């Protein structure tokens, strides 16, 4: 309660990387701008409105099977054209899952430790205030050896980076299509229709809503390309920490002087990273910052 | 209130195994990507738009009866094609039911015991704190003999595994269809229509939205195949427990030293499993962990 | 407040027996899988699209009257085909009503007695705790003679069983239809249409969405067949009670020793059944169970 | 707050009698089972799809005027067929209004008196409890003379019974229609259409959704026929009261012995009826019932 | 808070008079019972489906201008037929506005005075109770002279009565239409269409949904005719008050004996009317009524 | 809690600049005023309704590719016409992002400092009040040197101004189109359609909903042109501050006299700007303003 328990940078990255595919999916087939269907086949004028509908439905369904259609770029582009929103949704879910793993596996494990450290710091400040008028340091030393949680953090970040990279590769390949792959030549000649001569041998079909799909693909690719360096930088946990949140506390006599920094690539670095975001919410923090920047015992006893 | 009362692994497994069939059902016939109907039959040009609609409706309804249609893979694939979402929903409900059974039959039976054990541990810690300046052990010994709740747990997990396995078998069989089973040859020649010559003997019909169905089936099959080892590992209740949540408490003098572990395949193992998730929410737990890892009476009396 | 006041078995039975017909009704004509209409009649090609619509509407409306249509299985199957969802909804309401009767007629009558008995047990435990360092028994004896509430309970269960049995009979009869009863021969020859020769004498009509109806009927029948033994067992109120919730309390000296069991087929059995579910929510219950299973005065005075 | 202030029988009667017409109205034209329109007229094949639509609309609108149509059962059945849902809604509102009158005119007038009597009884019980270790009777005597509220109660019940009876009469008359009154012979020959010869003199029209209307009418009639004896019995206010809620209180010495019963057909009977439902929610009630059934001063001083 | 601040009769009148036009508007064009459009014109068979649609739209739009159509009852009935729901909504808003004026202009002005008088009465009762063991009268005398609020009340009631009367006149005139005014003779001969001979000179049009409009008009007229005497009686503010709410308080010695009645046609009458509804919610009121009806000092000191 | 933490001018600017593109997008294709589709192509009368639909869909999809269409203003205007709502939404998101950055990166960093300064001022006022009967100044001096937050503020304002300017440029260029660019000449001659002679070589297509798009573009351009000077003025942070919120506090003896102003272009100016909005919510502020404007020790001790 009241703890962010999640970095701002990696709550923005998750929000963008999950919302954007959802937004693109919702915009791709929104009736505000969209057209009727996704396939349209040119059937002869003698055909009725139920034979033309059959041709459309058959050639939309037979886009999986390459034994009927005769395209120029192969059946893979048509496969991609039919199932673009499904792939976008799959990518969105694959991005959203690691945040759920991190939440369900480290919400209390970080919440309890954060609350305990905050209470220890508050007690130390209260003792110093009531004394002038090191449990936490030993806990930090203990956390230095335990190299468990930072491994999980960097593993989740690495797998999210891998998913982003593979989505970038897929979208860059999809956008590179000829833009004439949206049209093909179908044929309704299966079963009893193979022998009669009242149907033309081949129908010219066009996959509508492909230019929109390519536009959305390029938008997603450029956004993910911009976003990837953010995760790459986030991977460097020790470099993120600015080792200055504890040097202010070293002015206090009760607190253990010469506090350890975040270097070492351990869970101590992760706990420092989680601290720098939440220490600003501690009342004693600013009451000590004012004294440390303006300095001493008189000002300490003033508040 | 405040107790998870359900393991994270088996709240993730239930969530995935129930949500995924619902998601696939919602995506199968979502107008965002879907087509008009699920069947389309080719009727002669002389037919009006109400005779073609009658042919479509008749050949969609007569997909149950094999005395009219003349298919190549039998009527079973057509049966499956018509009722795929219903089978998916049935599987989803069959997965969701055992969680409801476990909830309705063990929510208070686990909640009361957990609260009592937490209060006993808190009282023991308070007595130790107020003394320096074994009811729970006997209850654990009692729970060791009672082999009732772990049997229910493993029974529910086993039946969920069986349901997952049978769903995997069904989806693997459904996906293995020829992909040409979506088309068949129907005939409207029942009753007074049998004698007239103004109707063709047979109509070529195609079941639309079958490739989408097979794609969803393969997605569900691969996800359930990935998920099955998780439940298989979950079946091994004694191996899951890391017998270290009580060895920390053995430092306390008031608490009964040499606490029993979770081995034995009894309700004690299940209670240990439920404890390891909830002990992290106990205030005394971390206040004892700090002392045990840094060690003693002086630090015990400090807090 | 906080009292279940309804058995888990008979809150599951009601939930299943009411939700399942609603689920089947919602699935029967859900546009996710359904087709356009429920009747389709084959009209000559010379007919316009408003004469064919008139034929469809007339032959759908005249399925009540048997003087026009010429079917083979009689007009009763057609009656059933037209009004299947209405019958399902009627069955659902008939199942849901007895729970409403039991609630509106016994919610306070059971709530007040349960709260009074819980308070009496708490007071007895408190007196025993504050004394070492029988109003409830006489109330139980009084409830033994009063044979009123168990009669209402078994009457409601019996009538719900009767409704389930009659629904099973109806659904088993409906599913046993020939599956060719969905088609019939109609005729629009009433009034001024009787004399003209521009209309064919008879039209071939088919009732769509009948195979789906039969599938739903068989699903409902099999579920209700599975569910009926549950209600049959529930009818045996005295056998359900495990007479062990009071033998634990007999260890207490203040409480009246040799507590009466639930046998006798009276309201005492029903009150025992309601107690076994709610006693687990009493704080004194487990505090006495630990002592009784591990045993005595020293442990009693410990807590 | 916490007072039912409305009898269970007459909160069930109102709920049924208001909900059922709403349910029937919602089911009559629910697209889950319904058909396209409510009228269908057979126009010649030479007519376009806008002349046939004009014929349908004209013959649906001219069902009010009997100078055009030539029916066999008169224009009254057609009037009823067109406006069945409106009449059902009017009946529902006429049933729902008297509950609103009773609420808006007697919610505080009964709430204040009930709360005052409950407080008086609680004070009497407290005085008896604190004394061993008649304001309410005089108020009851006063209420005996005041014959005002029971008159309003029986008037509301009588008018609801009259409304139910007239609705039963109307629905029984509507269901008794020939079932061939849903078809008639219309004619579009008003104005400039009277002289041309390109239109047939008469059109055969059928009112669809009449068999459904008759089914709903018979359902409503049978339910209201079942419900009427309930209101008839409810009319007998003095017979409803079981004069036993005050004889238990006569054991108390402070309370006025020989309490008056509910007989007399006054507001005292109504207040007794409202008491028997709410006295079960009084804490002192059961604490006195236990003593009275098991009996005395020792048990009175025990609690 | 807790004060009705609005008479039950004039909260029922407003509710009915505002809800009923809304209900009629919602029912007039509810697709549950309604038909496709509100106008239908008979165009020759040679016309396409876009020329017939143009004829319908033109003759629906040109119902304002009388230079084209040739009706028999004038263009005023057609004007009324096109804009019936708008007039109903205007009437509903005109009825709803005066309640908003009364609320926004007299909610605190009545709330503060009511709360002050209630507190004064409570203080007088408390003083009498604590004394045996006239500010409010002077305030009433002051309110007697101030003839301001009753003028506003009767003005609002009078204007609502005038609005109801004019709505009754309008609806009675609208219902009295010939019922053949729903049909007329239109002509599309404006501009370049005046010279060509491929269009008929005149088209026979019918305004659908006019019989429904007349039915709703007669329903509204009869309800408002029933409702008008209620407002007429409400206009007589002094006659409404039953001068008995203060004669009970005159038994108290501290309270000023011989309290003034409500006669005089001043704001005192309105304050009496507002008091009789809210005095029943005062605890001291019934505690004094019991004593006054059963009588004295002994009973006064008893409570 | 209770702190605005965002200037009114820059919460109005963000609200307008984000809501207006959303409002225009919602109005552009709202069915309340809109037409059926966005493209319409004129196909020969011999074409069926499925060949004309194919022509429409093909020429709407092939508006990306310039090898088929033959327009007069180039393919860029057609590109803009197809994707106008997408560009509007992109602009809206680009405007909305910097507010999210400022919130997520400076909500606690400003909230904690504001609360600390408010508490310091309250303590100073309380000490002065309890004394007659400089931590904050030193903190202000410290904030004077720290030039960090104002840089972020002006950077966000500058980038929002740049986005507004580029959106203005784009909308001014889009509105300047010829207004005949909404029509073009398409051709369905790709694949097997290239050789047959049953199709015309070129089709005349028109992009509907372009005049509406240009109207919305001019509205957005004029609003953003009006709004840009507001952001330009907002860029001048030091000029915004009226250095009078601290000169009132200098009357107090305890507070450090001769308080520094906001000039200097540092974080002190930003903190002054945030103070002037929130100081009005401080109770001591007005209690000191009254004394300072009416002046002294007697009035200071009066409150």
From Swiss-Prot, chains A, B, C, D, E, F:
Q: Does the keyword Membrane apply?
A: yes
Its keywords, alphabetically, are: Calcium, Calcium channel, Calcium transport, Cell membrane, Differentiation, Disease variant, Disulfide bond, Endoplasmic reticulum, Glycoprotein, Ion channel, Ion transport, Membrane, Oogenesis, Phosphoprotein, S-nitrosylation, Transmembrane, Transmembrane helix, Transport
Ranges of the Cytoplasmic topological domain: 103-157
The domain of life for this entry's organism is Eukaryota
Membrane spanning stretches: 16-36, 82-102, 158-178, 207-227
Q: List the disulfide bonds.
A: 41-205, 59-186
Q: Kindly list the GO molecular function terms attached to this UniProt entry.
A: actin filament binding; ATP transmembrane transporter activity; calcium channel activity; gap junction channel activity; identical protein binding; leak channel activity; monoatomic anion channel activity; protease binding
Q: How is it modified after translation?
A: S-nitrosylation inhibits channel currents and ATP release.
Sugar attachment sites are: 195
Q: List locations, semicolon-separated.
A: Cell membrane; Endoplasmic reticulum membrane
The protein's topology relative to the membrane is:
Multi-pass membrane protein
Q: In which tissues is it expressed?
A: Widely expressed. Highest expression is observed in oocytes and brain. Detected at very low levels in sperm cells.
Q: Which reaction does it catalyse?
A: chloride(in) = chloride(out); iodide(out) = iodide(in); ATP(in) = ATP(out); K(+)(in) = K(+)(out)
Q: Which residues carry this modification: Phosphotyrosine?
A: 139
Where S-nitrosocysteine occurs along the chain? Answer: 15, 287
User: Where, in residue ranges, is this chain on the Extracellular side?
Assistant: 37-81, 179-206
Q: Name one GO biological process term.
A: calcium ion transport
The record's Gene Ontology cellular component field reads: bleb; endoplasmic reticulum; endoplasmic reticulum membrane; gap junction; membrane; plasma membrane; protein-containing complex
Please tell me the disease that this Swiss-Prot or TrEMBL record associates with the protein.
Answer: Oocyte/zygote/embryo maturation arrest 7: An autosomal dominant infertility disorder due to oocyte degeneration and death, which may occur before or after fertilization.
Q: What does this protein do?
A: Ion channel involved in a variety of physiological functions such as blood pressure regulation, apoptotic cell clearance and oogenesis. Forms anion-selective channels with relatively low conductance and an order of permeabilities: nitrate>iodide>chlroride>>aspartate=glutamate=gluconate. Can release ATP upon activation through phosphorylation or cleavage at C-terminus. May play a role as a Ca(2+)-leak channel to regulate ER Ca(2+) homeostasis.
Assembly information from the UniProt record: Homoheptameric.
Q: Which family does it belong to?
A: Belongs to the pannexin family.
What is the name listed in the Swiss-Prot or TrEMBL entry for this protein? Pannexin-1
Gene giving rise to this polypeptide: PANX1
User: Which part of the complete sequence is present?
Assistant: 26 to 369 of 426
